[PDB]
Each structure stands twice: as structure tokens, then as C-alpha cells.
Scaffold this motif. Structure first.
Motif, PDB file in Angstrom:
ATOM      1  N   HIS A 144      -2.446  -6.201   6.917  1.00 40.51           N
ATOM      2  CA  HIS A 144      -2.561  -7.190   5.855  1.00 40.51           C
ATOM      3  C   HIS A 144      -2.150  -7.010   4.694  1.00 40.51           C
ATOM      4  O   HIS A 144      -1.589  -7.717   4.084  1.00 40.51           O
ATOM      5  N   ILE A 145      -2.076  -5.587   4.350  1.00 39.02           N
ATOM      6  CA  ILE A 145      -1.343  -5.202   3.167  1.00 39.02           C
ATOM      7  C   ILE A 145       0.381  -5.676   3.159  1.00 39.02           C
ATOM      8  O   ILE A 145       0.697  -6.299   2.343  1.00 39.02           O
ATOM      9  N   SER A 146       0.902  -5.463   4.252  1.00 37.90           N
ATOM     10  CA  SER A 146       2.280  -5.746   4.729  1.00 37.90           C
ATOM     11  C   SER A 146       2.376  -7.361   4.677  1.00 37.90           C
ATOM     12  O   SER A 146       3.476  -7.730   3.734  1.00 37.90           O
ATOM     13  N   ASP A 147       1.531  -7.985   5.143  1.00 39.21           N
ATOM     14  CA  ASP A 147       1.670  -9.538   5.317  1.00 39.21           C
ATOM     15  C   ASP A 147       1.470 -10.130   3.754  1.00 39.21           C
ATOM     16  O   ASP A 147       2.210 -10.863   3.418  1.00 39.21           O
ATOM     17  N   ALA A 148       0.393  -9.651   2.880  1.00 41.39           N
ATOM     18  CA  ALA A 148       0.173  -9.864   1.648  1.00 41.39           C
ATOM     19  C   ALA A 148       1.346  -9.700   0.675  1.00 41.39           C
ATOM     20  O   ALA A 148       1.722 -10.429  -0.364  1.00 41.39           O
ATOM     21  N   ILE A 149       2.189  -8.434   1.030  1.00 44.45           N
ATOM     22  CA  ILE A 149       3.023  -7.978   0.298  1.00 44.45           C
ATOM     23  C   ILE A 149       4.382  -8.948   0.335  1.00 44.45           C
ATOM     24  O   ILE A 149       5.293  -9.187  -0.254  1.00 44.45           O
ATOM     25  N   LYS A 150       4.649  -9.172   1.793  1.00 47.50           N
ATOM     26  CA  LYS A 150       5.649 -10.022   2.113  1.00 47.50           C
ATOM     27  C   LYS A 150       5.566 -11.388   1.733  1.00 47.50           C
ATOM     28  O   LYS A 150       6.523 -12.117   1.220  1.00 47.50           O
ATOM     29  N   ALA A 151       4.188 -11.728   1.371  1.00 51.35           N
ATOM     30  CA  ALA A 151       3.936 -13.045   0.719  1.00 51.35           C
ATOM     31  C   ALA A 151       4.094 -13.277  -0.706  1.00 51.35           C
ATOM     32  O   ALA A 151       3.673 -14.325  -1.351  1.00 51.35           O
ATOM     33  N   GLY A 152       4.509 -11.945  -1.349  1.00 49.65           N
ATOM     34  CA  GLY A 152       4.665 -12.396  -2.786  1.00 49.65           C
ATOM     35  C   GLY A 152       3.393 -11.321  -3.952  1.00 49.65           C
ATOM     36  O   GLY A 152       3.596 -11.239  -4.923  1.00 49.65           O
ATOM     37  N   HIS A 153       2.300 -11.243  -3.262  1.00 47.43           N
ATOM     38  CA  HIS A 153       1.368 -10.451  -3.799  1.00 47.43           C
ATOM     39  C   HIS A 153       1.885  -8.978  -4.171  1.00 47.43           C
ATOM     40  O   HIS A 153       2.806  -8.528  -3.542  1.00 47.43           O
ATOM     41  N   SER A 154       1.416  -8.498  -5.433  1.00 54.94           N
ATOM     42  CA  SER A 154       1.978  -7.414  -5.912  1.00 54.94           C
ATOM     43  C   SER A 154       1.907  -6.138  -4.936  1.00 54.94           C
ATOM     44  O   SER A 154       0.991  -5.860  -4.401  1.00 54.94           O
ATOM     45  N   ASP A 155       2.918  -5.209  -4.697  1.00 52.98           N
ATOM     46  CA  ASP A 155       3.112  -3.858  -4.354  1.00 52.98           C
ATOM     47  C   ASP A 155       2.570  -2.907  -4.683  1.00 52.98           C
ATOM     48  O   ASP A 155       2.447  -1.822  -4.530  1.00 52.98           O
ATOM     49  N   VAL A 156       2.243  -3.037  -6.215  1.00 54.83           N
ATOM     50  CA  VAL A 156       1.652  -2.262  -7.027  1.00 54.83           C
ATOM     51  C   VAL A 156       0.316  -2.577  -7.590  1.00 54.83           C
ATOM     52  O   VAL A 156      -0.153  -3.869  -7.938  1.00 54.83           O
ATOM     53  N   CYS A 157      -0.623  -1.508  -7.508  1.00 55.28           N
ATOM     54  CA  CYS A 157      -1.908  -1.489  -7.944  1.00 55.28           C
ATOM     55  C   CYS A 157      -1.985  -0.948  -9.442  1.00 55.28           C
ATOM     56  O   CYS A 157      -1.769   0.427  -9.577  1.00 55.28           O
ATOM     57  N   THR A 158      -2.326  -1.725 -10.454  1.00 57.31           N
ATOM     58  CA  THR A 158      -2.394  -0.913 -11.585  1.00 57.31           C
ATOM     59  C   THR A 158      -3.987  -0.608 -11.736  1.00 57.31           C
ATOM     60  O   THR A 158      -4.658  -1.469 -11.808  1.00 57.31           O
ATOM     61  N   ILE A 159      -4.427   0.794 -11.389  1.00 51.20           N
ATOM     62  CA  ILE A 159      -5.807   1.230 -11.284  1.00 51.20           C
ATOM     63  C   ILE A 159      -6.505   0.613 -12.584  1.00 51.20           C
ATOM     64  O   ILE A 159      -6.305   0.867 -13.839  1.00 51.20           O
ATOM     65  N   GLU A 160      -7.701  -0.361 -12.394  1.00 51.86           N
ATOM     66  CA  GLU A 160      -8.628  -0.460 -13.210  1.00 51.86           C
ATOM     67  C   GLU A 160     -10.159  -0.855 -12.559  1.00 51.86           C
ATOM     68  O   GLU A 160     -10.238  -1.850 -11.860  1.00 51.86           O
ATOM     69  N   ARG A 161     -10.786   0.058 -12.919  1.00 51.54           N
ATOM     70  CA  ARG A 161     -12.152   0.058 -12.344  1.00 51.54           C
ATOM     71  C   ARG A 161     -13.250  -0.525 -12.819  1.00 51.54           C
ATOM     72  O   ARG A 161     -14.241  -0.626 -12.242  1.00 51.54           O
ATOM     73  N   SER A 162     -13.418  -0.855 -14.164  1.00 53.27           N
ATOM     74  CA  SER A 162     -14.577  -1.395 -14.962  1.00 53.27           C
ATOM     75  C   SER A 162     -14.489  -2.795 -14.388  1.00 53.27           C
ATOM     76  O   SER A 162     -15.766  -3.223 -14.308  1.00 53.27           O
TER      77      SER A 162
END
Lengths: 109, 109
Positions: free
Chosen positions: A20-38
Motif C-alpha cells: 500500500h505504501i509503495s502504491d500510494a507513493i507511486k501515485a504521487g502521495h508524499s514519501d516524506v512524513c513530517t511528524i505531527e502528533r497533535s
């Protein structure tokens, strides 16, 4: 640099989440998570609005709810619960030491 | 009667598929397939919405897409491709002589 740290997602261990991650990243969703927990509770609710549970599966979000990049527009797919729980723990435990705002590149291997 | 014919699913030959059928029946999904072939493409697409393909495995549905009982709400599980191919052929061939509307009880042995 566009990221601060790299996580090498273990597709051998969690192949369905990994796919799913690979698919989503092939589809242009970001490969980088900018951590934001709030704001993660809100993003999950946005990403999953209108998506019901399915028995035997978890609803996997990419980008994840704990990332600035998550919420609306996130790719959502069903992943077998065992695979997604193990993935969720692996990622959660590996990110627990980074502060909010840390930019994590994901490489699925 | 609530069925017209019985099929004894061979769990010894296809144990993974058989396990999914047994589990799904324990969960209250019908043990009876009422054969319906015209709408099978659409039921299949409905049961598998948001479930990606997985290499080396098939997405197994119970009830089956060829049954009135299938479609939305069908139990889905990834099953190894060899086991599920053979199962699908075993069932397909044993049901090929029955008209739409025939009610088949499955017993997993």
C-alpha cells in the motif's frame, strides 16, 4: 535537504502494508512524513470518512495520520490486520524518539 | 428443504481455502450458495472494493461471487494462489451442470 531521517520500511515482514505504501507513493502521495502528533485524530477521521470497517482487515492510511501530509486525500486501503498491526508497531516504535516537525523519508524495501 | 444439492468441499486438498470457508460459515455467512451467474462480475467487484491484489495470493470470497449471497459483505481473505486456483476449479467444475437458482449446501470435510 528534503528530509531529516530515513526509515527503511520492511516489506518482507509487512508485505501488504508495504505494498500500500509503495502504491500510494507511486501515485504521487508524499514519501516524506513530517511528524505531527497533535492533529492526528482529526486527520484519521478525515481520511476515513465514508470508509467502513471490514472484518479481517484494518484501514491503512498513506500518508499516515501522524504526518502533516495525512488527512484528506490520503490513500486508504484494506490491509490484513496482522500485517497492518505489525507495521503500525514497527513504525510507531521507530518514530517515537523524533520530535514533531522531524521529516522522515520512507523507503519501502 | 433449504437446499437442492450438497457439495463436500475437500479441505484435505485445499486446506487454506477450506479454512476460510469454514471460518466464514462459523461467522454466519451462508453455507448455501444459490447459483447466480449473470451478476457475478458485479458482486466480485463489490466484495473486493478497496482490497488490493497481493502477489502469490488470491482474494477469496465467501459467499462466492457466483452466488446470490455474495457481493457486499462477503468475507474476503488472502489465500495462497495454488490452493485457491485448485479450489476454484474443483467448485466451478462441480457446479457447471446446475442451473442458476439451484441451491447448493457446502459442507467442509
Amino acid at each position: 535537504a528534503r528530509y531529516d531521517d530515513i526509515l527503511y520500511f520492511p516489506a518482507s515482514r509487512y508485505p501488504e502494508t508495504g505494498a500500500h505504501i509503495s502504491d500510494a507513493i507511486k501515485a504521487g502521495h508524499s514519501d516524506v512524513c513530517t511528524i505531527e502528533r497533535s492533529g492526528a485524530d482529526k486527520r484519521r477521521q478525515e481520511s476515513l470518512k465514508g470508509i467502513p470497517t471490514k472484518p479481517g482487515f484494518d484501514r491503512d492510511e498513506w500518508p499516515m495520520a501522524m504526518c502533516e501530509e495525512g488527512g484528506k486525500g490520503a490513500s486508504v486501503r484494506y490491509v490484513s490486520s496482522s500485517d497492518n498491526r505489525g507495521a503500525g508497531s514497527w513504525v510507531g516504535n521507530r518514530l517515537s524518539g523524533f520530535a514533531d516537525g522531524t521529516r522522515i523519508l520512507f523507503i519501502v524495501q
